[PDB]
Design a protein that fits this description.
PDB class: hydrolase
Number of strands: 24
Radius of gyration: 22 Å
Largest sheet: 3 strands, antiparallel
Name: Endo-beta-1,2-glucanase
Strand content: 5-15%
Strand order of the largest sheet: 4-3-24
Assembly: monomeric
Number of helices: 15
Oligomer: monomer
Bound molecules: a molecule of 2 linked components (NAG-NAG), a molecule of 2 linked components (GLC-BGC), 2-acetamido-2-deoxy-beta-D-glucopyranose, beta-D-glucopyranose
Keywords: Glycoside hydrolase, Talaromyces funiculosus, sophorose, complex, hydrolase
Helix content: 40-55%
Structural class: alpha+beta
Entry title: The complex structure of endo-beta-1,2-glucanase from Talaromyces funiculosus with sophorose
């Protein structure tokens, strides 16, 4: 089994010569993240956002006791592959006993569902959706800030992950897995009945965050109300689009309201050309920040079955990789936790605005911190190139640990986020496993919504993305290393 510090045991060219071998090492150590008090609570089956690790030792210290439906989506997607008997998912979940992987996934998902249902019972006002929650005790509570508030985006991610898991479980023909799947189907189906009432304001406007009068009141209690928080709507092509599809297919909207969803969204779907120095022009979908995380939706629905979409998103990775070469960055950018202050052991903040400003709606960006999970969209197109970029960042001081990759490093190598999260680690894992879009596509076809998806989304993308430039620009490989400035590898992983 591989050394903890395997990233620098390979050369870059060796990664490209045999991506699978390298990925096999990656999955093994990533899987160590999957432990009680590190990434989830085995008592209630619920994710934690992650955990801090000690500056010197690289051992788990201080967990994050909160999580959200977005991290749930990463865990559930992993479990969908695991229960289906994926050998790669087993290398993650149960490397020394692959046969146990399906049972492990089934067991946790059973415990998890029980917890979801206790939460629904105590907080029926959420209508079967999840706010940001505290998962450190047996029963979920909303985090303080998220009492009477629920986000559409995170829930959109979870729902299609559960959709995949159900399909995966039923595909096994194992009777107890099928029974588990049907209980999850019941949970998932309940959200269909509440989705429009909670999140659809009308005229194509979908709340980013819904304010609930009182989470203790049933959805249709005579005093219960739902209203959008401010004027922030799920109206763009990023992760929130998953929730749009949920409303369209299952929400009971009229044809006019479905048309209004896409009409209201249309101005946020924009073609722009990346062009810096000798790189480009490359036509891409304009990003929010052009953080890698914005591409999440392609993990969960079969966007890449549509060739115009596949081409536009392939271009994104031409731009993302080559942008880093031309601007001399030894990694790529995504929303991420900032460095740890070694004196306190605390993360100094969260950096949302990390991406590629010239092809972004939001041009005010912090670009001093890079993260391995930035490669997840690259991995979907070219796992060698993806893993080369991953390796380049992972070789930075303290950027591997006994639970796999570390959250983030400054590109100048003077600081590291001594932290593990689902977002910075298991996003990449889910990309290595090919997303769940195959499972989702199967179930969509069986429920006769696949054709509608293709027609609508091909129409929207083909209307905006014409005469692509830069499709001849090859993906770029890392040309700079993370500087060594005197940071010392974790004593358990060196
Ligand atoms: C991420 O952490 C860095 C420090 O490591 C922050 O950058 C510093 O910001 C302070 C206070 O605004 C300045 O006085 C320093 O000059 C900056 N230091 C460096 C090394 O650039 C950065 O603001 C943090 N970002 C977030 C979002 O937390
Ligand atoms: O706080 C609500 C919700 O915000 C989410 O942040 C969004 C981000 O993911 C998205 O890429 C951009 C552009 O649409 O908008 C928002 O910043 C965050 O991901 C969720 O976890 C939060 O619940
Ligand atoms: C959630 O609770 C409500 C009200 O208590 C109930 O009507 C509904 O069936 C519950 N949902 C699930 C999936 O059990
Ligand atoms: C919310 O509803 C519960 C159940 O009726 C009630 O106990 C509580 O006082 C209400 N909270 C507020 C802030 O009105
Ligand atoms: C950012 O997006 C909004 C919503 O579509 C748009 O109106 C605004 O002009 C965009 N800003 C830039 C700088 O592209
Ligand atoms: O889930 C990744 C990150 O999301 C951010 O929005 C939260 O502020 C962090 O606590 C968390 O680590």
């Amino acid at each position: 089994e591989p050394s903890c510090r395997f990233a620098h045991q390979y050369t870059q060219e060796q990664v490209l010569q045999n991506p699978s071998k390298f990925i096999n090492d990656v999955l093994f150590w990533e899987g160590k993240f999957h432990q009680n008090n590190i990434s989830y609570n085995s008592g209630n089956g619920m994710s934690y956002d992650g955990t801090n690790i000690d500056w010197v030792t690289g051992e788990g210290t201080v967990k994050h006791p909160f999580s959200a439906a977005s991290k749930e989506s990463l865990q559930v997607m992993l479990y969908a592959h695991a229960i289906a008997g994926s050998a790669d998912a087993a290398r993650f979940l149960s490397p020394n006993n692959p046969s146990a992987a399906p049972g492990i996934a089934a067991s946790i998902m059973d415990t998890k569902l029980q917890t979801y249902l206790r939460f629904n019972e105590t907080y029926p006002g959420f209508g079967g959706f999840l706010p940001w929650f505290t998962s450190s005790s047996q029963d979920l509570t909303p985090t303080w800030d998220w009492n009477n508030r629920v986000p559409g985006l995170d829930n959109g991610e979870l729902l299609w992950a559960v959709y995949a898991f159900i399909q995966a479980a039923e595909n096994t023909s194992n009777k107890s897995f099928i029974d588990l799947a049907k209980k999850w189907q019941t949970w998932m189906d309940y959200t269909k009945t509440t989705a429009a009432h909670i999140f659809y304001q009308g005229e194509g406007k979908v709340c980013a965050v819904t304010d609930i009068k009182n989470q203790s009141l049933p959805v249709y209690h005579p005093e219960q109300t739902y209203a959008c928080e401010g004027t922030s709507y799920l109206n763009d092509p990023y992760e929130g689009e998953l929730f749009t599809w949920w409303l369209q297919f299952f929400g009971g909207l009229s044809d006019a309201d479905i048309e209004a969803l896409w009409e209201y969204k249309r101005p946020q779907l924009v073609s722009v050309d990346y062009h810096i120095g000798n790189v480009g022009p490359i036509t891409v979908q304009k990003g929010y920040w052009f953080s890698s995380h914005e591409t999440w939706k392609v993990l969960e629905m079969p966007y890449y079955d549509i060739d115009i979409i596949r081409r536009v998103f392939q271009n994104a990775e031409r731009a993302r990789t080559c942008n880093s070469v031309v601007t001399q960055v030894p990694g790529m950018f995504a929303s991420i936790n900032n460095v740890t202050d070694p004196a306190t052991g605390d993360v100094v903040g969260y950096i949302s605005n990390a991406g590629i400003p010239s092809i972004a709606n939001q041009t005010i960006q912090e670009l001093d911190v890079i993260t391995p999970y930035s490669v997840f969209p690259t991995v979907l197109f070219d796992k060698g190139v993806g893993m080369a970029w991953w390796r380049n960042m992972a070789i930075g001081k303290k950027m591997q640990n006994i639970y796999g990759s570390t959250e983030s490093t400054r590109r100048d190598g003077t600081g590291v986020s001594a932290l593990l999260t689902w977002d910075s680690k298991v996003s990449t894992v889910n990309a290595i496993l090919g997303g769940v879009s195959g499972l989702v596509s199967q179930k969509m076809k069986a429920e006769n919504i696949y054709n509608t998806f293709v027609e609508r989304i091909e129409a929207e993308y083909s209307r905006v993305f014409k005469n692509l430039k830069g499709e001849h620009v090859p993906f770029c490989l890392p040309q700079e290393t993370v500087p060594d400035t005197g940071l010392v590898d974790f004593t358990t992983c060196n």
